[PDB]
Amino acid sequence: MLKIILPSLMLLPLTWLSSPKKTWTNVTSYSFLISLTSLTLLWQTDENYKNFSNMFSSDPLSTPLIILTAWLLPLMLMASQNHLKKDNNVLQKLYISMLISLQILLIMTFSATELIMFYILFEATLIPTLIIITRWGNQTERLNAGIYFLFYTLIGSIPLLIALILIQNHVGTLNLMILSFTTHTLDASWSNNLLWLACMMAFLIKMPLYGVHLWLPKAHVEAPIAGSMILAAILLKLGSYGMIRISIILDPLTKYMAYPFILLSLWGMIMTSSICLRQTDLKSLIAYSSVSHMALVIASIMIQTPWSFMGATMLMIAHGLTSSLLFCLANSNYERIHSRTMIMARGLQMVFPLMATWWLMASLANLALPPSINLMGELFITMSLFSWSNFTIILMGINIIITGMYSMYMIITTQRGKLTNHMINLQPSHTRELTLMALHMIPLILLTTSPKLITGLTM
Amino acid sequence: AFCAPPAYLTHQQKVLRLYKRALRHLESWCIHRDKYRYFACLMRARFEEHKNEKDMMRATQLLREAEEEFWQNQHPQPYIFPDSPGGTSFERYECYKVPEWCLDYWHPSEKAMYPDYFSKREQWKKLRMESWDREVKQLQEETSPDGIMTEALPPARREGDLPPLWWHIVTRPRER
């Protein structure tokens, strides 16, 4: 793992003592080489897992998150490049350093073994995100957005820390797989119910539950494109990783202390897919899409079945890639029109006839067009919840319909009408952003061809 | 598609448009030309029977009743010419109606062909940055200071001046 972290740490000097003309190039190339080297983790020839130290470890669930994290970096580098172009060399080096720090901390917290290290890193992920969102946003509500994000997270995270201490005291360690080989059943008492609540709310907030989803749309709409991408792809996954790791000891409480969250997820799914029909901001639309998709992940972790966890992992990675792609697609226009309003610009696919394809495929994925991992996840979540109770299929179908509606709405109100001929400032498509979209898509094709790397722990 | 409605339609215009719609729906109902001519002559007789009348109140009443008769006897699937609203070709070539400014982004190796074309496009601009300032004054100076205003536009009264606000009525794409 250290062969992955040390070079990521060295990307910093490179960034600062690189000349003002080659820093972007060099750091991007080496970030790509890091993404390449990270594939050592995929050499899993046995059911035994990796353990490089007492402090690090890798699993079939942490490896894909780690590789997606190491892959998204150069894409964010490329995407944060047109803006902050006039900004000073020092400022853009600061930006690059923020990105690299996020990379390193996310890799660490995915490769961690101890819940408290996981905690300090899952809570150190705030500084760079807050700084990016507040120092490089364009509106005046980015400050309130950072407040919301930061404090939702911390209010959810404190009781988690307290529960971790309670455990570290009852048991003598917070180490994973020891917390597994020594776990006991519980007494189904109110103290342990509150322990459950504490352990869970942090992650149920970091991946937006229906009722506490009021930090994601803000952060997205007010944040730059790299912040949007990382928030949509990985910061929404820290909660899933944490719950998949902490739910092993809370048995057998989640059999009955999970109903409220299953209900909230299955309902907010509909109640956000519907907002995706009547929202005017493209970015907020995609945010509510992310919410409606993470609801499935939540409801699937809650029921604790192998198919459920498999679908959760598949959909996690797939939604990461697809949301990053959609955000970058909307950014391509924003850079040209400086307005997130969707119905303003229309009739594209005439001057941008190719980007209308990327727009289309990112939509084919979000609406779960087979063969695709979005669907290979949704289907198995649906089957697991149908075994749970057969009446979930109703809400699942409603959500499917609304998704197929608002995806094509987003397509047609931007690319499939007639042009706003009064738009003189439609600079043709950059090779850079076409490459962004291609780098987002192709890995989805490859993971659809080899979805054995994406099932997870159970499979 | 070339003018703007007036602040209010006059009784004459109302009656004329009612006549036109009534005849179009008569065509829709009667598929054969002989029948169409027969009943069109009948309808025009019905109309002319009240052309030399002047009582405005009774006229408006006859019109309010004829419009109801029309709504009650109208064909619900009338004939619409293809390229017109409701027709099977309305807004069909808007996909190929690309504007003119889309050529300012072309690449030298693209306008390298059609060189004789792009030379004209150039001097068509020279004919625009010069003909702009005087198109404003002609509007400023021809303004009604009594508040009243409508969607009309004047021509140019000189040798060399051009109609104000022409670039978009000129330069627009073919229909094809």
């Binding site: 005439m350 001057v351 941008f352 006839p353 043709p428 498509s429 950059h430 090779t431 | 190929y96 690309v98 504007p99 003119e100 889309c102 050529l103 982004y105 072309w106 690449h107 190796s109 693209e110 059609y114 074309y117 794409p173 073919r174």
Partner: peptide
């Protein structure tokens, strides 16, 4: 024969 307006497509 006439001229068909089109975007760049070179980029």
């Amino acid at each position: 024969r006439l001229f068909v307006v089109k975007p760049s497509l070179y980029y």
